[PDB]
Amino acid sequence: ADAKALDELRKPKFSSKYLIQHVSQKLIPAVK
Amino acid sequence: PIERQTVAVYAATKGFLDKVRVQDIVAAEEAVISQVNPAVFKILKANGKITPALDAHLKAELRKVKLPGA
Amino acid sequence: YLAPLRSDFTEEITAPKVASASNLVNEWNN
Amino acid sequence: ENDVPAILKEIDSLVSREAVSAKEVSDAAVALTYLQVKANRRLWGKVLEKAGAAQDYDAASLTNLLWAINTGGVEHFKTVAELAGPAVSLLPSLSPVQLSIVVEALGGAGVKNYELYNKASAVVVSKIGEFKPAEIARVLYGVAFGGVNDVALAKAAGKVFASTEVDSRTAAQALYALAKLGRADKATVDALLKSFKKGTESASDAAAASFALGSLSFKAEKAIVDALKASAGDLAPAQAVEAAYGLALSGATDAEAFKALFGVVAPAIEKAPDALEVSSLAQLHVASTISGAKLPAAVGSFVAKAFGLAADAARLKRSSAESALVADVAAATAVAFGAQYRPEVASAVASYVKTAPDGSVLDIAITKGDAKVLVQAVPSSLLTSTTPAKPLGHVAAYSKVREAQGYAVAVVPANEFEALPDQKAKAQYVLAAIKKVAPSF
Amino acid sequence: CTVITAEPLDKLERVELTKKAEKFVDAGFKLVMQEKIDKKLLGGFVIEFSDRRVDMSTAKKVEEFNNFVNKLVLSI
Amino acid sequence: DLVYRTGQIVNVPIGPGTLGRVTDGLGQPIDGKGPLTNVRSSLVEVKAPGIIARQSVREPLFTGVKAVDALVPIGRGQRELIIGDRQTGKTAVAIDAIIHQKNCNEQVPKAQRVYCVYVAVGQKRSTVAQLVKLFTQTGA
Amino acid sequence: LTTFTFSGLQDAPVAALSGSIKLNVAAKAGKAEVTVAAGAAKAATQVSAAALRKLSGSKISLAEVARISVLHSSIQNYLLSLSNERYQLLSQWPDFTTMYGKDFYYRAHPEDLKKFYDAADEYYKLYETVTEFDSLSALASQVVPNYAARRRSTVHPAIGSTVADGAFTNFLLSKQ
Amino acid sequence: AVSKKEVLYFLSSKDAESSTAVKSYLKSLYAGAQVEATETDASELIAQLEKKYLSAQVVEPGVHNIALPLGESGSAPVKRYAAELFNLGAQAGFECPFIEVSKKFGQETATSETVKDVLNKTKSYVSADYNAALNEVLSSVEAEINGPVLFDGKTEGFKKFAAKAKAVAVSRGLPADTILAYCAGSANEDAADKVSKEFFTWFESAYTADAAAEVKAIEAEAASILDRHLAKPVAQIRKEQASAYASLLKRAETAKGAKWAEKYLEDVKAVQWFDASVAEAPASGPKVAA
């Protein structure tokens, strides 16, 4: 719990990054 | 809604709106909906029917209303 | 504190649409 | 009487108060540099926070702060790049050595400030005899690493490096700057290599001259190579891998120099295999392949994978005029091996894109039985910025690593290829470049 | 027939799209292909039978590609 | 001029993405709110469900008009003609049946909610702009 | 930073510039005699000219530790520095609780007194809502998605109208 | 897990969650795992679609990691912001903005015969204040020729347009001739250097002005949202923000099994950790295991 990391705390949190990744994961096997 | 419609036709067909003048029957029946208790509308919504334990309570509640004209 | 996630692309290259300065300083001064 | 964490806590309380001016920030950063405080990052972060927050700035505080930011090896791009305001506002007010440290610090971090480098280049070519050559090398380092392709400052520096005897560290800085510019002007480089006659006091500087002479592909100079083999504990693994890379690219075969250099960088990879960049692991595979010195068992296959990773990643982020050039050169290989129609050249260039052994993808990989001839296009990013316009050292690096996997790499540069009239000339040019390395095809 | 392409045809493209276009005649019909040039097509061909049109061009392949992509990302 | 056949019979976008929107005679939204997200095309001329596909009309459809809900009551699945002369209360009976479903949808569970569709044929365009303004400020 | 740095003990600071921390070095032929003191402490260590060249070997590589984002904290910081400029003009509000006595009640018109009490109630509303600082962190999340979608461009993250105009002249005024 | 097109784009990335995935992949590779094959497939449209949707996954944690220079003095924070966006575009696989939007122009106008379709098909990338000023000049030369101005360059029916379009370009405020001389080059490096050093002053002016326009629009949006927010009472503010936060939590909790939903709730829990950790020691900040 306490004292997570530095590399875990450097992440921007509510960026998209995974809705983009979800679209590119559901899209490219469907468009090929 | 449906319950304030059936209470108003109840009060018009069970004689409660006789001797009320015809000009303000359109104005009496807001009192028949506002002055009659708001929790008697819940029972007629939940039962969907005038039970015998409700007509004897509702027609007791259609007498404690202050009607215009009268 | 959190925002809805969006996955769409800006296709245009447009002006960033500077909004109108609200009247709150003049209204609170009034 | 000698308690250094006590002074660390007192300068922690110096920069934790709310109205700290720039001079206390400068002196705290300088005190952290002289005390070698690399374990504690939070104190350096407090100094950088108060450095970005402070607004008034004179010359000496700004230059002491920027010197401390360099020498401590601390990097925060927002704070350093926002220090270009005090730099460009005080640029006539800075001394020659102060302007050197300012432009060196704002270039070495990567600040993209073209007003600063233009108004610094005008000062270096306006007062050129007034500057010590170490300051010339510092501004050359800054304007080279700031993304400015400045021909005027490079030539006005080269005239001074022909005129004045310079130091070893000054020469190593100017070599690094000219290699980042990608110049390979021999009249400057051989004038700067007479300054490696005292020995080099810092093996960072011998490693940097090694990397610069490797990327410019000049020579193995033997006053740099033995200095690297004698002081290979002075270097970090990411510095020593660039040392070994620039030794392999420039024609060195000293097996003990590469042994002492790989003794730095192998226990780092067994210490942490993620500690180095994938660029540095590709450079390790290049240096372990060209000089042929051995790595450990878990390390050699690892950098063999990571070379294919870095080359394939540079294929995905291709410059899109290099993609056009690879398309044109692959069509020239199609016409060259005999294809006079468009579906013929189309199905040929769809066929030349066979994969590499390490998992990479080669764009033009021709196979006739067992002999394989690869064609390599070199657009302008890997070309030298001068009028001879030869390919850089990384071209021969990729050629030598592909030649150790069963290929005969036929380098087709674009300074000659797009000077050609049409596709027949390009086809016979590519066939000439193929026959010059393997006439079996 | 009328085959209208981007650039003028050489000998192997003609034999190839003639073999492609004879899978569109509804007999053992002897296609009498006409050749025209339109660089608004970026490669491929479009066949004008004056009764039907089969557009094998790559400009329409790009347009249907983009319509499918803009169709699919709004369902995801 | 050249006429190309689309290959397809006439179809409109259906689904819950049409809820809230003002479309034209075939699907295309005319309210200025972009495309219909979350929608699916289907034919406009579908065969009605046959005998075995039905059951008897037993649930009540409350219009909120007590001249209707007492004397001529309406069940769910029943078609009821509102016929009258030129400016009687014909639309006003039908707008009151739609607004009342908003008042009932907040009180019923999710399964027995009534989703309304108002087809405005041949009317003024500002007459139907007065109804989108009325359905917005009521919430229907 | 680059992998090779060329700074240290050549044209270094030989003196400190503040009054809060005392630095003096003796740059000899090989090494330096660095002795520093900051208030209650003393520090006297020895560095060589090649001891500072080893310092930039491993980089520090600082990074922001943010609650949500560095972007979101910058937008929230601007919202806080704007709430400060509103709170500065709520600090210049004349004291109405100097006129709450019954001397000012009964000399005054009843409608003007009800207006004065409404003005005091309004100041309490404005001051209760300008100091709700837990709402700025959710106000900043309404500037974030539209900005991030404007940066998520098909051309470039840093593209704008002026660069695109200059490239349109270069594309147009060159041949075809 | 990454799909090896995921990780080749993240080698030059420097955000946190890309770098930990790269480091976990390389620590997988060091422990006796082979790389999979690179796909030499997915013809040009699918390749462009993949690099479009893979540049966005490098851009989107990078945009959120760049502090906006809102409410700042001097152009040096604006130049920091624009250089950070430049570096993020270069890490994500874009070129220089000039090269990239010129490539977009040349992609949208490979079919162009007239200047009318040039000025109508690149309308989405040129500002309206410049597109209308070039449209009226195209109409002015079209009234002269009474024949369609074609996109040839050697035809002087085009050059009668282009000599006035250069006048429009210099009346906008941008030096067109040093841009044309930069992207035309020269033979000797000493005479091309003096015009590249003028092009780069224009370029810094242009991208600093674009970043400054974006920053001023973000400042105007923030001030508008705040002045609309400081007009409410406090209970309205609290119930509005609590209702929006509750709806946005339930929209990510009704998503079960999606990766973005687990990442969303994990970031909510990390924000709650940040709040608890500054509640534990408010003078020291959050606890960082260094």
Ligand SMILES: Nc1ncnc2c1ncn2[C@@H]1O[C@H](COP(=O)(O)OP(=O)(O)OP(=O)(O)O)[C@@H](O)[C@H]1O
């Ligand atoms: N129950 C009602 N009580 C009072 N006024 C009503 C009632 N119903 C309708 N009206 C009034 O009658 C007028 C006509 O109503 P409505 O728009 O429904 O006519 P209509 O039958 O739809 O005819 P048209 O289609 O030609 O408009 C309206 O302006 C409305 O104000």
Ligand SMILES: [Mg+2]
């Ligand atoms: Mg009507």
